[PDB]
Structure 1
Amino acid sequence: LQCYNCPNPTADCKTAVNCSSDFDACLITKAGLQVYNKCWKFEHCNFNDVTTRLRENELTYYCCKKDLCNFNEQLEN
């Protein structure tokens, strides 16, 4: 229900609030050092989807159905 949403990419992902139906799941991504977790539409969850809504090219991401259950450290290293 209440999902993580930072409009500003952050490694320390803290700002998590109750959001609407637009997103479907909690999506965290990491590019180099930058980390961005956010309420994300799981259909609009796609490697290409993330890379286009982030204007960046190379990354490693993960989106999980249940909100707030998504964080960077689950990705390798």
Structure 2
Amino acid sequence: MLQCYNCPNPTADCKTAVNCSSDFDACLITKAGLQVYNKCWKFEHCNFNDVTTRLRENELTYYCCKKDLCNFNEQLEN
């Protein structure tokens, strides 16, 4: 298992640590406008097409990693 911060809805400070299911091999943190997403994710989906479409967001920056709780917000700039 990989541990990630994971919140089902976007929020300013997601600190809910989850033990991701085995289908997830990465953590994701995305800043889309004023919203922030933190999710258990899949490396295969660490690209603009898969992030934008799944979150239904247009403009965004994303950061994927594979270390426990690595998807903290400060991984991305303002």
**Equivalent pair of 1:4/1:68 in contact (CA under 8 Å):** yes
CA distance in 2, matches of 1:54, 1:38: 11
Residue 56 of structure 1 deviates from its aligned partner by 1.3
In the alignment, structure 1 segments of 5+ residues that lack a partner are none
**Equivalent pair of 1:22/1:41 in contact (CA under 8 Å):** yes
Number of aligned residue pairs: 77
TM-score normalised by length of structure 1: 0.88
CA distance in 1, matches of 2:30, 2:46: 11
CA distance in 1, matches of 2:54, 2:9: 13
In the alignment, structure 2 segments of 5+ residues that lack a partner are none
Residue 2 of structure 1 deviates from its aligned partner by 2.1
TM-score normalised by length of structure 2: 0.87
**Equivalent pair of 1:23/1:41 in contact (CA under 8 Å):** yes
User: Which residue number in structure 2 is paired with residue 72 of structure 1?
Assistant: 73
**Equivalent pair of 1:29/1:59 in contact (CA under 8 Å):** yes
**Equivalent pair of 1:25/1:67 in contact (CA under 8 Å):** no
Residue 68 of structure 1 deviates from its aligned partner by 0.7
User: Which of the pair is proportionally richer in helix?
Assistant: 2
CA distance in 2, matches of 1:38, 1:67: 12
**Runs (4+) of structure 1 moved beyond 2 Å?**
none
Aligned-partner SS, 2:18: strand
Residue 17 of structure 1 deviates from its aligned partner by 1.1
